[PDB]
Design a protein around this ligand. Structure first.
Ligand SMILES: CN(Cc1cnc2nc(N)nc(N)c2n1)c1ccc(C(=O)N[C@@H](CCC(=O)O)C(=O)O)cc1
Ligand SMILES: O=c1ccn([C@H]2C[C@H](O)[C@@H](COP(=O)(O)O)O2)c(=O)[nH]1
Length: 287
C-alpha cells in the first residue's frame, strides 16, 4: 500500500543491479546511477519518513530548525544531542580545510546562512546577521502567499562565491515550490545522494519543510519530487541495504503542528508532532 517507499527501495535495487562502480573524491568505492527521479505524496499530513529502517527524526527536526535560524554553529546543534555536523566543525577538520582562524563549530556560510542571509559577507558564526543579505525563505513565503502561480519560487544553497568558505558544498542544492489548487508542492534537486544514510534523512527534511511552509501559508500539501544527480550507495553499506530491501514498507507517518504558529521562525521542536511512526529496526551504516 505504501507504493512511494517501494519507489525508494526500487531505486536502491536499480543502483545495486545497474550502477557503475566508481571511487569517489575520498578514494572509497561507490555504486552510482546519474539522474534519478521519484515523487512522494505529502497529501493529508503525510511525511515520507522511511518505515523499513529508522530515520533520525530528532536530527531531521533539530537540523531544519537550526537551518531556519540561519545558524552555522555545529555546537548549537550538538547541544540538542544532534552530532551530525560535529566532525566538520572540529579543530582538526577546520585546520585541514585551511580555516585555521575559525573557532571550533564554525561550519562557514552553509545552508541556514544562504537561506536567510544570501549574499551577506560571512564574518564567522558568532556575528549577528539579522537583516543582512537576501532572506530567500521569507521571499519564497511572500511569493507563495501573494503570487502562488510564480515559476520563480526557488530556495538555493548553491552560492558559488561562498563554496570555498563552506565546511562542505551543499548536496541538497536547490528546491523549487509551486501551488496548485491550494496545494503546495516541492521539487528538490539533490546533486549528490547517499541512498543509505543521506537520502532518507533529506526526504524527511524537505517533506517536513514543505509541511511547515504550507502551514504558515494556510495551504494544503501536494507532492515532493526528488531529483538526484549522483544517486549512490557506498560499497560498505551494500549488505545493510540488501537487508533493508527484504522488508515490506508500512504506511508513512503524518505530521501535525501545535499552537499559534504565524511565521516560519515560530516553530519549535515541541510544536512538531509525528503521528504513527513505528519503523522497523535501524540498520547500522557507518562512515
Ligand atoms: C545529513 N547528515 C550529515 C552528513 C554529513 N556528512 C556526510 N558524509 C557522507 N559521506 N555521507 C553522508 N550521508 C553524510 N551526512 C547526516 C544525517 C543523519 C545521520 C545519522 O543518521 N546519524 C546517526 C549516526 C549513526 C551512524 O553513523 O550509524 C546519529 O545517531 O547521529 C548522520 C549524518
Ligand atoms: O544531507 C546530506 C549530506 C551528505 N550526503 C552525502 C552525499 C555524498 O555521499 C556526500 C557528500 O559528498 P560530495 O557529493 O560533496 O562529494 O555526503 C547526503 O547524501 N546528504
Amino acid at each position: 500500500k505504501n507504493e512511494d517507499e517501494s519507489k525508494y527501495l526500487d531505486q536502491v535495487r536499480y543502483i545495486l543491479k545497474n550502477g557503475e562502480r566508481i571511487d569517489d573524491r575520498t578514494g572509497v568505492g561507490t555504486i552510482s546511477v546519474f539522474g534519478m527521479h521519484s515523487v512522494y505524496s505529502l497529501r493529508n499530513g503525510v511525511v515520507p519518513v522511511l518505515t523499513t529502517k529508522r530515520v533520525y527524526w530528532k536530527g531531521v527536526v533539530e537540523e531544519l530548525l537550526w537551518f531556519i535560524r540561519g545558524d552555522t554553529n555545529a555546537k548549537h546543534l550538538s547541544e540538542k544531542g544532534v552530532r551530525i555536523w560535529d566532525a566538520n566543525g572540529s579543530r582538526q577538520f577546520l585546520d585541514q580545510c585551511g580555516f585555521s582562524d575559525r573557532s571550533e563549530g564554525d561550519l562557514g556560510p552553509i545552508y541556514g546562512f544562504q537561506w536567510r542571509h544570501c549574499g551577506a559577507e560571512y564574518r564567522g558564526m558568532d556575528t549577528d546577521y539579522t537583516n543582512q543579505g537576501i532572506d530567500q525563505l521569507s521571499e519564497i513565503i511572500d511569493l507563495i502567499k501573494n503570487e502562488p502561480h510564480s515559476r520563480r519560487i526557488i530556495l538555493s544553497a548553491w552560492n558559488v562565491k561562498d563554496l570555498k568558505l563552506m565546511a562542505l558544498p551543499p548536496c541538497h542544492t536547490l528546491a523549487q515550490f509551486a501551488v496548485r489548487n491550494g496545494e503546495l508542492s516541492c521539487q528538490l534537486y539533490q546533486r549528490s545522494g547517499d541512498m543509505g544514510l543521506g537520502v532518507p534523512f533529506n526526504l524527511a527534511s524537505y517533506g517536513l519543510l514543505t509541511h511547515m511552509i504550507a502551514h504558515v501559508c494556510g495551504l494544503k500539501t501536494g507532492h515532493l519530487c526528488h531529483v538526484l544527480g549522483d544517486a549512490h550507495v557506498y560499497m560498505n553499506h551494500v549488505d545493510a541495504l540488501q537487508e533493508q530491501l527484504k522488508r515490506q514498507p508500512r504506511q508513512f507517518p503524518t505530521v501535525r503542528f501545535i499552537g499559534n504558529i504565524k511565521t516560519i521562525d515560530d516553530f519549535t521542536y515541541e510544536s512538531i508532532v509525528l503521528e504513527n511512526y513505528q519503523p522497523m529496526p535501524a540498520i547500522k551504516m557507518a562512515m
